[PDB]
């Protein structure tokens, strides 16, 4: 019983100002979990979408700027796809862009420019070995939609060039999911 | 955002015994509401299936017998489709089968025989005028999936021939529904 | 169980004389109900036509004159189709023909001339909102054939030019109806 | 104004037990009249189906058993079509099956088996001469739908083999009729 | 007598500032009535457009910004189509975007960006049941153009992200309507 | 924004009796103005049909008789089309029919006979020069729909033969007009 749908979530991210003169970059990570998109249900149905299995097909991360088009001290960054839960260490002012030479690098124009990334994440099945599957719609694993313990999906790391002014963003993540085995429970009343 | 699925519900019905010698029939009615198939949800989602609109496409009423194949004093009844909320009055021992000459009559062999009816119900929009639409998949009205006040759908009336022995049934109603406008709400935690 | 038939009814209408010199018009309305065409039945069958549902397909209103061809002070009127239960107010001598500029106006030659109107009426489901369906034979609503409380159908308003002489008419309304679900009940005797 | 419909009626028949050891048969007759299927109407319409003429096209006699499938002392009988109102005399325990060598004989397995007969009856126009028409849909006579004096149609005789146990049946006769000349009368109220 | 035309109306909407630090959204609703687009007429014609019936085909809601392109603290919202008169409750600072996961969601870039929505509304025939028709130009109901009591059409709800600065908009609603039955009345003078 | 419609108006005309023995004719004129068909509106809309421009395409003048078919002293007259506002002088008993040799003459049988004239009028732009356009639907001038000062259109003159009895008529003029530039004004309330 397949049901392809779309789930979204919005949150903020700010790159604080720095008095440093050099071009330094701010590094951060981004994971994706389905608990943040799918709330708990009620009653005999533990989740709000009554299905048993799921598998995330795609994610769309949108960096919607919060800064005016008149803001100066512009910069240039990079967003890369990291499917293994080993990101570059979080840094405030690093002397280089680590994600620049990555094959999945897209340039981030800053601060007042929109940046989208559309990709297929991978689940963290074993963080010790960090193995994942290649892209195959027919062979992608089905995970279970747990009650409160779903596994973290992974796949984006960023590097933003710091500035004299604060750079704020409203980040909207949209997960395109595919469920299976409609499992609604209908007790009497 | 269409999602065709299937919702079921099971309950009992018994035709008590009678010392009456004549062939008399027991008349009863059967309505269908979505509250009995779809429970309430939890949190910001008032229902367990996160959709706004619905429309019932078909219903399958199954009379699963509870009686052995050796039971005697067998009989013959009738099930008809009544799309307007004006049934024949409920009777214990009526001297005739009212639903026999109906154009939608199917014979009910009793007591140990299975009886199915598969049809398209109609909602009770105005019980004073009792108007309904003909069968058209493209023009069927969309109703709202209310929180605790959904409207009763209608469409089956029965007439069972009484017997010296009690005739029990386990009735399984299956509604084939079609939802629209996925409306999941994901607050923080 | 479809059965298309034809039901008729005859009654009178008179436009009384007036000493008024000007050309004035007499306005009146015309509704259609099935109780006036279908009498009550007898016994377990509440109506004389043993069916459950109905829907009026067409109506033919015929103004058969009662006046001789030698009658003078002739005039000219208008008949229009009003499918919403908000007619021009009934008037005895109005200074104009209100139904003249209506898109459904047919000229009424008076007094000794025959006037027919053949159209599809609409039921009064909600007089507050006054909504109706367009003409579609496949999508027309089925109403219930009530026992003594059927809903009024609507669709004709007239304007007759007054005269020194009385103008009488014998009005024959013919409704072309379509029933469904033969529901005869046959108790013993 | 043709209207083909279907009228039904249900009643009981029992073959009482006998201590007789031999194989004996119980003979009985079965006539069909439209008064038992069509009740009287009400008011100016003397009958509940407002038509003038009728002619019976077919009849379906269904012997629905009342006995369990575990009942012993089973037997074998015969049902024949007798279109002339001269049946074999009614007998309780006759030493042979009279209807066995009839060209229209169908075997009746007893007691827990269903038996249907579908045929075209004939009216009793003159019981002295006992003449009837062959099967022709285009040339079949139209009779009048009388008020309380309709003519008996004929066409089935049976022979059931007696048993130590009582053999009960619920007999459902369905007549497929064809009416003509819709004659509804609509007085005022 | 069909006449397709276009009626417009302009009004303001402001999202007041908030000292709240979090990303919160301001929720509001939007209904459409024809009294706000069609004024009352004069004399025997109660309305300014001389027609009897109407049905709204489409509506175009245009959020024309009032804010400069240099305004900061930008945000991201959502507009959805709600055809049933049960909107998300009006809120000043809600901790999430309720209309984000709706199938009819369009992103609203704020504050200095234009947002259009073009859709087919539905009338509020019964607010208790909240039923509406699917999109069909041939089967869409005709309503009556009342004098001062027309029914509210429905179909848009919004969620705007709050900001430190006031976000003003000039909202221009354009209804594409279709009238019927030209009913001009021409008394003497 | 074109809108072709139809506007009507009804009024009386009488040819009084004369003791004169000779055949004399009564001459009269007939102009057409849109103020007599289109009333004033209300509010910011000065007219009841909310358009700016107009041009009259056709006019249908219908002489509906008021006299019985038994009336004697019958006669013969003439109706001609006069597109320039210079009619034959109005006369009570003229010794000849002036409009008889006109190329646009149609015979008027009197008194109990219907007479129609269907033609394209012309506006009175300059009564001193009296110039008009030939018939061309594509090149016909658009006039302005003034508030209370519209220009008179012209195009019919008549000659009725007098009689011993009074000859009354109910004259119904129907103008087929074409408007342009829908200009509805919708202030607040």
F168 vs D44: CA distance, rounded Å:
51
Shortest Cα–Cα distance, D149 to chain B (Å): 23
C90 vs F135: CA distance, rounded Å:
43
- By CB neighbour count within 10 A (0-12 exposed, 13-18 middle, 19+ buried), where does F37 fall? buried
CB B178 within 8 Å of CB B120: no
E45 touches chain C (CB under 8 A): no
Q: Do A9 and B186 touch (CB under 8 A)?
A: yes
The tokens describing C166, both together, are 């009385």
DSSP 8-state secondary structure symbol assigned to residue A36: G
Q: Which of C151, C183, C188 sits opposite B102 (nearest CB)?
A: C183
B133 vs B156: CA distance, rounded Å:
17
E-proximal residues of B, 62-121, CB under 8 Å: none
Q: Which of F47, F33, F51 is nearest to F121 (CA)?
A: F33
How many Cα atoms within 13 Å fall on the side-chain side of residue B106?
16
Measured between CA atoms, the residue of chain E closest to residue F181 is E5
Q: Do E23 and A10 touch (CB under 8 A)?
A: yes
Q: Which of C73, C97, C100 sits opposite F66 (nearest CB)?
A: C73
Shortest Cα–Cα distance, F12 to chain E (Å): 13
Please give the radius of gyration of chain E, using alpha carbons only, rounded to the nearest integer: 19
The phi and psi torsions of C36 (rounded to 5 degrees) equal: -75, -15
Please give the torsion angle defined by the CA atoms of residues E81, E83, E84 and E89, in that order, rounded to the nearest 10 degrees: 20
User: Per this entry, what is the length of chain C?
Assistant: 189
Q: Do E36 and F186 touch (CB under 8 A)?
A: yes
The tokens describing D97, both together, are 């099956």
Output the 3-class SS for A48-101: CCCEEEEEEEEEEEEEEECCCCCCCCCEEEEEECCCCCCCCCCEEEECCCHHHC
Cis peptide before C60 (omega within 30 of 0): no
Q: Which of B7, B35, B43 sits opposite A40 (nearest CB)?
A: B43
Shortest Cα–Cα distance, A109 to chain E (Å): 17
The phi and psi torsions of C69 (rounded to 5 degrees) equal: -75, -5
CB C50 within 8 Å of CB C183: yes
Q: Do C101 and F65 touch (CB under 8 A)?
A: no
Cis peptide before E88 (omega within 30 of 0): no
Resolution (A): 2.8
Cis peptide before E107 (omega within 30 of 0): no
CA dist list (Å): E104 to A59, E60, E81: 19, 15, 6
A155 vs F12: CA distance, rounded Å:
89
How many Cα atoms within 13 Å fall on the side-chain side of residue F154?
20
Q: List, in order, residues 6 or more apart from D149 with CB less than 8 Å away.
A: none
A126 touches chain B (CB under 8 A): no
DSSP secondary structure of A107-152? EEEESS--EEEEE--EE-S-TTT---PPS-TTTPPPEE--SS-PPP
DSSP secondary structure of F39-106? -EEETTEEESS-EEEEEEEEEEEEEEE-S-TT--S-EEEEEE--TTS-PPPPEEEESS-GGGS-TT-E
The angle at the Cα of B174, spanning B171 to B180, to the nearest 5 degrees, equals: 155
Establish whether chain A is in contact with chain C, requiring a minimum of 3 CB pairs below 8 angstroms. Answer: no
Residues of B in contact with C154 (CB under 8 A): none
Q: Do B134 and C125 touch (CB under 8 A)?
A: no
Q: Do E41 and F38 touch (CB under 8 A)?
A: no
The tokens describing C4, both together, are 């298309």
CB B30 within 8 Å of CB B156: yes
Residues of F in contact with C23 (CB under 8 A): 10-12, 170
Cis peptide before A111 (omega within 30 of 0): yes
The phi and psi torsions of A38 (rounded to 5 degrees) equal: -115, 110
DSSP secondary structure of D85-154? S-PPPPEEEESS-GGGS-TT-EEEEESS--EEEEE--EE-S-TTT---PPS-TTTPPPEE--SS-PPPEE
B182 touches chain D (CB under 8 A): no
Q: Which of C52, C125, C186 sits opposite B131 (nearest CB)?
A: C125
Q: List, in order, residues 6 or more apart from B47 with CB less than 8 Å away.
A: B38, B39, B40, B41, B145, B147
D172 touches chain B (CB under 8 A): yes
The residue whose two tokens read 């071009």 is A23
The phi and psi torsions of E24 (rounded to 5 degrees) equal: -115, 155
E21 touches chain C (CB under 8 A): no
CB B167 within 8 Å of CB B37: no
Neighbouring chains of C at 3+ CB pairs under 8 Å are B, D, E, F
D44 vs A22: CA distance, rounded Å:
107
C1 vs D5: CA distance, rounded Å:
8
The angle at the Cα of B60, spanning B159 to C179, to the nearest 5 degrees, equals: 60
Neighbouring chains of F at 3+ CB pairs under 8 Å are C, E
Q: Do A41 and B39 touch (CB under 8 A)?
A: no
Dihedral sign from CA coordinates of C34, C39, C45, C50: negative
F187 vs E142: CA distance, rounded Å:
26
C133 touches chain E (CB under 8 A): yes
Establish whether chain D is in contact with chain F, requiring a minimum of 3 CB pairs below 8 angstroms. Answer: no
DSSP secondary structure of F96-152? S-GGGS-TT-EEEEESS--EEEEE--EE-S-TTT---PPS-TTTPPPEE--SS-PPP
CA dist list (Å): B99 to B160, C2, C40, C181, E76: 10, 17, 21, 11, 60
Q: Do C181 and B103 touch (CB under 8 A)?
A: yes
E189 vs C147: CA distance, rounded Å:
51
Q: Which of D5, D37, D40 sits opposite C182 (nearest CB)?
A: D5
Q: List, in order, residues 6 or more apart from A101 with CB less than 8 Å away.
A: none
- By CB neighbour count within 10 A (0-12 exposed, 13-18 middle, 19+ buried), where does C139 fall? middle
Q: Which of B96, B129, B133 sits opposite C151 (nearest CB)?
A: B129
Residues of B in contact with E102 (CB under 8 A): 181-183
Q: Which of F7, F64, F68 sits opposite C72 (nearest CB)?
A: F68
Across chain C, where does the E strand assignment appear? 3-15, 25-32, 40-42, 45-47, 51-65, 75-80, 91-94, 106-110, 115-119, 122-123, 143-144, 153-161, 167-182
Measured between CA atoms, the residue of chain F closest to residue C100 is F8
The tokens describing B44, both together, are 């910001």
CB E27 within 8 Å of CB E98: yes
The tokens describing C129, both together, are 């909102």
Q: Is C48 helix (H, G, I), strand (E, B) or coil?
A: coil
CB E67 within 8 Å of CB E112: yes
Q: Which of F171, F53, F184, F181 is nearest to F123 (CA)?
A: F53
CA dist list (Å): D119 to A119, C5, D32, D39, D152: 73, 30, 12, 24, 16
Shortest Cα–Cα distance, B101 to chain C (Å): 6
Q: List, in order, residues 6 or more apart from E133 with CB less than 8 Å away.
A: B139, B141, B142, E122, E139, E140, E141
The technique by which this structure was obtained is cryo-EM
The residue whose two tokens read 């379906």 is D60
Q: Which of A140, A79, A69 is nearest to A107 (CA)?
A: A79
């Amino acid at each position: 019983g397949i049901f392809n749908t779309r789930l979204s979530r919005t949150f903020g991210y700010t790159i604080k100002r720095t008095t440093v003169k050099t071009p330094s970059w701010a590094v951060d990570m981004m994971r994706f979990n389905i608990n943040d998109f799918l709330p708990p249900g009620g009653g005999s149905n533990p989740r709000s979408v009554p299905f048993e299995y799921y598998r995330i097909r795609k994610v769309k991360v949108e960096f919607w700027p919060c800064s005016p088009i008149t803001q100066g001290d512009r910069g240039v960054g990079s967003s890369a796809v990291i499917l293994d839960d080993n990101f570059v260490t979080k840094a405030t002012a690093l002397t280089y862009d680590p994600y620049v030479n990555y094959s999945s690098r897209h340039t981030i124009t800053q601060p007042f420019s929109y940046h989208s990334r559309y990709f297929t994440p991978k689940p963290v099945l074993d963080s010790t070995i960090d193995y994942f599957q290649p892209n195959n719609k027919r062979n992608q694993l089905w995970l279970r939609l747990q009650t409160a313990g779903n596994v973290d999906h992974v796949g984006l790391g960023t590097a933003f060039e710091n500035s004299i002014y604060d750079q704020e963003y409203n980040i909207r993540v949209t997960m395109y999911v595919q469920f299976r085995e409609f499992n609604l429970k209908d007790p009497p009343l």
